[PDB]
Amino acid sequence: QRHPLVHREVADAEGRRAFAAVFDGAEPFLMDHEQLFPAVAYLEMARAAAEAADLSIAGIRNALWISPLVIRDRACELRVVLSDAESGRAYEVSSSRGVHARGLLVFDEPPAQPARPPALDIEAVRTRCAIEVDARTRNEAMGMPASYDKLWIASLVHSDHEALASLQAPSAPGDEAFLLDPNLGNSVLVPAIFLSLIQDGEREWRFPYTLEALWIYSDPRRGAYVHARRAAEDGQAARFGRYDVDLVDASGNCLMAFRGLTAVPAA
């Protein structure tokens, strides 16, 4: 099955399966993101690799992002290794430049996915988010790697601890091979990161560091709103805040739920 992020299966041992892809930097997902492999793309790669291995994935738990991968001058191979774990499979994404991401792929069996949240009362959320912003200007000023025009964000409102973004799809569909296209994934994350910044009074962009979970309920391409919101608790010994963010359709149904995301600055 063709996928932009998983090109071939590679040999491994002991109840491990490994997959690889080579990127040259001319891929739209990279070109659209300052040549930096998006955090969200690792999640898609891991899921796609598991799908290639005939596994059925309900979600991802305990995701971590380590070293950034920048691909511009020369092509590079990225490898993802899957190993047996209680949840399903552990994954590690690496290259000759180190480890970039890791986490846990949660299988559909035995059931481990939390019940889909109830439909979001979008109007209620709109009434409690008083501040309207020019998302393009604000986020670009903060150093977001993503090209705003390639994102789905059309509007953004917020309170001191909650945000709601409306979405409009790009006219040209994505590569339909993607379950979560990076542009759409970044659209979901941007409102949460924006919230992290304005809660801390900061202006430097933050990148995903840890994520407690990602649950996939239905096709994210039906997205209409992104609802982000400081989590009930932050990470353990944590300087940086933790956020929950959901992608919902026009009826408020949850398409994807990101639980416990912590984003942090970079050098």
Short mmCIF file of C-alpha atoms in Angstrom, two decimals:
data_model
loop_
_atom_site.label_atom_id
_atom_site.label_comp_id
_atom_site.label_asym_id
_atom_site.label_seq_id
_atom_site.Cartn_x
_atom_site.Cartn_y
_atom_site.Cartn_z
CA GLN A 1 0.00 0.00 0.00
CA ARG A 2 1.54 3.29 -1.05
CA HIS A 3 2.11 5.87 1.67
CA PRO A 4 4.18 9.04 1.47
CA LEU A 5 5.97 8.23 4.71
CA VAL A 6 6.50 4.51 4.45
CA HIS A 7 8.31 3.25 1.38
CA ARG A 8 9.66 -0.21 2.15
CA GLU A 9 9.89 -2.94 4.73
CA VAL A 10 13.33 -3.56 6.11
CA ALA A 11 14.80 -6.62 7.75
CA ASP A 12 14.92 -7.03 11.50
CA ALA A 13 14.93 -9.74 14.17
CA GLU A 14 13.07 -11.16 17.10
CA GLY A 15 9.47 -10.04 16.86
CA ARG A 16 10.35 -6.73 15.36
CA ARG A 17 9.32 -5.24 12.09
CA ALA A 18 10.94 -2.23 10.54
CA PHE A 19 10.03 0.14 7.77
CA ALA A 20 11.83 2.91 5.97
CA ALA A 21 11.44 5.94 3.75
CA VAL A 22 13.85 8.33 2.11
CA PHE A 23 13.04 12.03 1.87
CA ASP A 24 14.75 14.55 -0.30
CA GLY A 25 13.21 17.74 0.93
CA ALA A 26 11.05 18.41 -2.08
CA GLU A 27 8.06 16.68 -0.53
CA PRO A 28 5.24 19.15 0.05
CA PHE A 29 4.99 18.25 3.73
CA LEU A 30 8.60 19.36 4.18
CA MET A 31 8.46 22.33 1.84
CA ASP A 32 5.37 23.54 3.68
CA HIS A 33 7.22 23.36 7.03
CA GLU A 34 10.65 25.01 6.63
CA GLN A 35 12.24 21.70 5.85
CA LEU A 36 11.61 20.45 9.36
CA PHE A 37 9.89 17.08 9.68
CA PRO A 38 6.74 17.84 11.56
CA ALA A 39 6.10 16.28 14.90
CA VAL A 40 2.70 15.23 13.74
CA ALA A 41 4.14 13.42 10.72
CA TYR A 42 5.93 10.96 12.99
CA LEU A 43 2.61 9.90 14.40
CA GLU A 44 1.26 9.33 10.94
CA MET A 45 4.39 7.41 9.95
CA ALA A 46 4.16 5.11 12.92
CA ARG A 47 0.49 4.46 12.29
CA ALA A 48 1.08 3.90 8.60
CA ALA A 49 3.87 1.44 9.35
CA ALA A 50 1.66 -0.48 11.71
CA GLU A 51 -1.09 -0.54 9.03
CA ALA A 52 1.50 -1.93 6.61
CA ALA A 53 2.27 -4.67 9.07
CA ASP A 54 -1.43 -5.59 9.09
CA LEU A 55 -2.06 -4.15 12.54
CA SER A 56 -5.23 -2.35 13.54
CA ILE A 57 -4.56 0.83 15.46
CA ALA A 58 -6.85 2.64 17.81
CA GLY A 59 -4.42 5.27 18.83
CA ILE A 60 -1.06 6.32 20.20
CA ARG A 61 0.03 6.70 23.79
CA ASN A 62 3.06 8.22 25.42
CA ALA A 63 4.50 9.90 22.40
CA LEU A 64 7.81 11.66 22.75
CA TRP A 65 9.73 13.77 20.36
CA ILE A 66 13.51 13.94 20.68
CA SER A 67 15.79 15.28 17.94
CA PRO A 68 14.56 17.50 15.15
CA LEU A 69 15.07 16.33 11.62
CA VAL A 70 15.81 18.95 9.05
CA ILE A 71 16.12 17.84 5.44
CA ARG A 72 17.26 20.30 2.86
CA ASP A 73 20.74 19.85 1.47
CA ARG A 74 20.71 16.09 0.99
CA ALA A 75 18.23 13.24 1.15
CA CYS A 76 17.91 11.15 4.34
CA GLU A 77 16.41 7.88 5.35
CA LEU A 78 14.00 7.59 8.25
CA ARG A 79 13.32 4.26 9.88
CA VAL A 80 10.60 3.19 12.21
CA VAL A 81 10.92 0.04 14.28
CA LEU A 82 7.95 -1.69 15.87
CA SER A 83 8.36 -4.01 18.83
CA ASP A 84 5.97 -5.99 20.99
CA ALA A 85 4.34 -4.13 23.89
CA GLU A 86 1.31 -4.56 26.13
CA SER A 87 -0.62 -1.86 24.38
CA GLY A 88 0.25 -3.25 21.00
CA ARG A 89 3.58 -2.03 19.74
CA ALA A 90 6.27 0.29 20.81
CA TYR A 91 7.71 2.42 18.04
CA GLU A 92 10.96 4.30 17.63
CA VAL A 93 11.65 6.54 14.68
CA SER A 94 15.31 7.05 13.91
CA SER A 95 17.95 7.93 11.44
CA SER A 96 21.68 8.23 11.20
CA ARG A 97 21.17 11.44 13.13
CA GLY A 98 19.66 9.88 16.21
CA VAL A 99 16.30 9.14 17.66
CA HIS A 100 13.50 11.47 16.61
CA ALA A 101 10.36 10.03 18.06
CA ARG A 102 8.99 7.18 20.08
CA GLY A 103 5.77 6.03 21.54
CA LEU A 104 3.20 3.30 21.85
CA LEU A 105 0.76 2.13 19.21
CA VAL A 106 -2.44 0.94 20.83
CA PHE A 107 -4.24 -1.87 19.14
CA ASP A 108 -7.92 -2.19 18.70
CA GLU A 109 -7.71 -5.54 20.63
CA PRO A 110 -8.20 -5.81 23.49
CA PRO A 111 -10.26 -2.66 23.70
CA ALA A 112 -8.29 0.21 25.10
CA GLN A 113 -9.73 3.30 23.46
CA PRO A 114 -11.73 5.56 25.73
CA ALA A 115 -15.26 6.13 24.62
CA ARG A 116 -15.63 8.82 22.07
CA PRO A 117 -16.40 12.06 23.80
CA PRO A 118 -19.83 13.49 23.55
CA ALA A 119 -20.50 15.95 20.76
CA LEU A 120 -19.07 19.38 21.40
CA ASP A 121 -21.44 22.26 22.02
CA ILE A 122 -19.69 24.57 19.66
CA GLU A 123 -21.95 27.51 20.27
CA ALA A 124 -21.32 27.30 23.99
CA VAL A 125 -17.62 27.33 23.38
CA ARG A 126 -17.90 30.36 21.09
CA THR A 127 -19.71 32.32 23.82
CA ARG A 128 -16.92 31.74 26.35
CA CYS A 129 -13.95 32.67 24.12
CA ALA A 130 -13.91 36.45 24.00
CA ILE A 131 -10.74 37.32 22.23
CA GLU A 132 -10.59 37.21 18.46
CA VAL A 133 -7.25 37.12 16.71
CA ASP A 134 -5.62 37.31 13.33
CA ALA A 135 -4.21 33.83 13.44
CA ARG A 136 -1.93 34.29 10.53
CA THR A 137 -0.25 37.37 11.82
CA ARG A 138 0.06 36.18 15.38
CA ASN A 139 1.39 32.73 14.76
CA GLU A 140 3.82 33.75 12.03
CA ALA A 141 5.21 36.37 14.36
CA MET A 142 5.86 33.63 16.81
CA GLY A 143 7.97 31.61 14.45
CA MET A 144 5.64 28.83 13.41
CA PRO A 145 7.36 26.64 10.83
CA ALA A 146 4.11 25.84 9.05
CA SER A 147 2.95 27.80 6.05
CA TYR A 148 -0.30 29.42 7.19
CA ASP A 149 -1.82 29.18 3.74
CA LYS A 150 -1.34 25.43 3.81
CA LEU A 151 -3.07 25.08 7.12
CA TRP A 152 -6.82 24.76 7.51
CA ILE A 153 -7.23 27.51 10.06
CA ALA A 154 -9.73 30.18 9.06
CA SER A 155 -10.44 31.89 12.34
CA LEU A 156 -9.32 31.75 15.95
CA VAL A 157 -10.95 32.86 19.24
CA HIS A 158 -9.86 32.33 22.77
CA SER A 159 -10.19 32.94 26.48
CA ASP A 160 -7.36 32.84 28.97
CA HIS A 161 -7.42 29.03 28.96
CA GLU A 162 -9.45 27.81 25.99
CA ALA A 163 -9.36 28.26 22.24
CA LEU A 164 -11.58 27.56 19.27
CA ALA A 165 -10.41 27.57 15.67
CA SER A 166 -12.67 27.21 12.68
CA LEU A 167 -11.33 25.24 9.72
CA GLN A 168 -11.68 25.38 5.97
CA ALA A 169 -10.19 22.73 3.79
CA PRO A 170 -7.74 23.61 1.08
CA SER A 171 -9.32 23.40 -2.39
CA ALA A 172 -6.87 20.77 -3.50
CA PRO A 173 -7.25 17.60 -1.55
CA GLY A 174 -4.29 16.10 0.10
CA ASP A 175 -2.55 13.01 -0.80
CA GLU A 176 -5.42 10.72 0.17
CA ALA A 177 -2.93 8.12 1.32
CA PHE A 178 -2.54 10.09 4.52
CA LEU A 179 -4.98 9.34 7.33
CA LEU A 180 -3.76 12.50 9.05
CA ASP A 181 -2.10 14.82 6.51
CA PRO A 182 0.54 16.90 8.23
CA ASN A 183 -1.09 20.14 7.22
CA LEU A 184 -4.32 19.11 8.92
CA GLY A 185 -2.43 17.74 11.92
CA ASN A 186 -0.56 20.97 12.35
CA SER A 187 -3.87 22.80 12.10
CA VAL A 188 -5.05 20.90 15.13
CA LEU A 189 -1.89 21.55 17.12
CA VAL A 190 -1.46 25.24 16.37
CA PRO A 191 -4.33 26.41 18.53
CA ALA A 192 -2.98 24.45 21.52
CA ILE A 193 0.49 25.81 21.03
CA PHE A 194 -0.90 29.30 20.68
CA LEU A 195 -2.69 28.81 24.00
CA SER A 196 0.54 27.59 25.62
CA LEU A 197 2.26 30.77 24.53
CA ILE A 198 -0.35 33.16 25.58
CA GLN A 199 -0.74 31.54 28.98
CA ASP A 200 2.94 31.91 29.63
CA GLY A 201 3.24 35.30 28.07
CA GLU A 202 5.71 34.06 25.53
CA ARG A 203 6.36 34.68 21.91
CA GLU A 204 8.81 31.95 20.89
CA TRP A 205 7.29 28.93 19.06
CA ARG A 206 6.88 25.73 20.91
CA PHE A 207 7.17 22.21 19.54
CA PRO A 208 5.52 19.04 20.68
CA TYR A 209 7.62 17.28 23.38
CA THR A 210 5.27 14.79 25.00
CA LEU A 211 1.73 13.57 24.31
CA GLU A 212 -0.24 11.36 26.58
CA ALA A 213 -2.53 10.09 23.88
CA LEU A 214 -3.97 10.46 20.41
CA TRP A 215 -7.25 8.68 19.73
CA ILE A 216 -8.55 8.41 16.18
CA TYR A 217 -12.33 8.01 15.87
CA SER A 218 -13.16 8.86 12.30
CA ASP A 219 -11.78 10.58 9.19
CA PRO A 220 -10.21 13.89 10.17
CA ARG A 221 -10.93 15.37 6.78
CA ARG A 222 -14.40 16.15 7.98
CA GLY A 223 -12.88 18.63 10.35
CA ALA A 224 -14.57 21.89 11.05
CA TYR A 225 -13.31 23.10 14.44
CA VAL A 226 -10.32 22.66 16.74
CA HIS A 227 -10.98 22.98 20.50
CA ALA A 228 -7.98 23.38 22.76
CA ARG A 229 -7.79 23.86 26.51
CA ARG A 230 -5.43 23.67 29.34
CA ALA A 231 -5.50 20.16 30.75
CA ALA A 232 -6.63 19.27 34.22
CA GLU A 233 -3.06 18.67 35.29
CA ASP A 234 0.31 19.36 33.72
CA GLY A 235 3.16 16.89 33.32
CA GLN A 236 5.03 15.76 36.42
CA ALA A 237 7.98 17.98 37.19
CA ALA A 238 6.85 20.43 34.51
CA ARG A 239 7.80 23.93 33.56
CA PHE A 240 5.61 23.95 30.45
CA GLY A 241 1.89 23.49 30.34
CA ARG A 242 -0.18 20.59 29.21
CA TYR A 243 -3.10 20.85 26.86
CA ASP A 244 -6.00 18.81 25.50
CA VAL A 245 -7.10 19.48 21.91
CA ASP A 246 -9.84 17.93 19.83
CA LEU A 247 -10.64 17.99 16.16
CA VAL A 248 -14.38 17.96 15.61
CA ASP A 249 -16.72 18.01 12.66
CA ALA A 250 -19.44 20.58 12.06
CA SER A 251 -21.79 18.69 14.33
CA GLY A 252 -19.28 18.63 17.14
CA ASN A 253 -18.43 14.99 16.75
CA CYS A 254 -14.91 14.04 17.83
CA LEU A 255 -12.70 12.95 14.92
CA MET A 256 -9.46 13.00 16.82
CA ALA A 257 -8.61 13.59 20.43
CA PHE A 258 -5.18 14.74 21.60
CA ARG A 259 -4.80 14.30 25.31
CA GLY A 260 -2.06 15.77 27.36
CA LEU A 261 0.14 17.62 24.94
CA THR A 262 3.15 19.52 26.22
CA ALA A 263 4.99 21.77 23.77
CA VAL A 264 8.31 23.38 24.58
CA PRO A 265 10.66 25.90 23.04
CA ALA A 266 13.72 25.09 21.01
CA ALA A 267 17.15 26.59 20.36
#
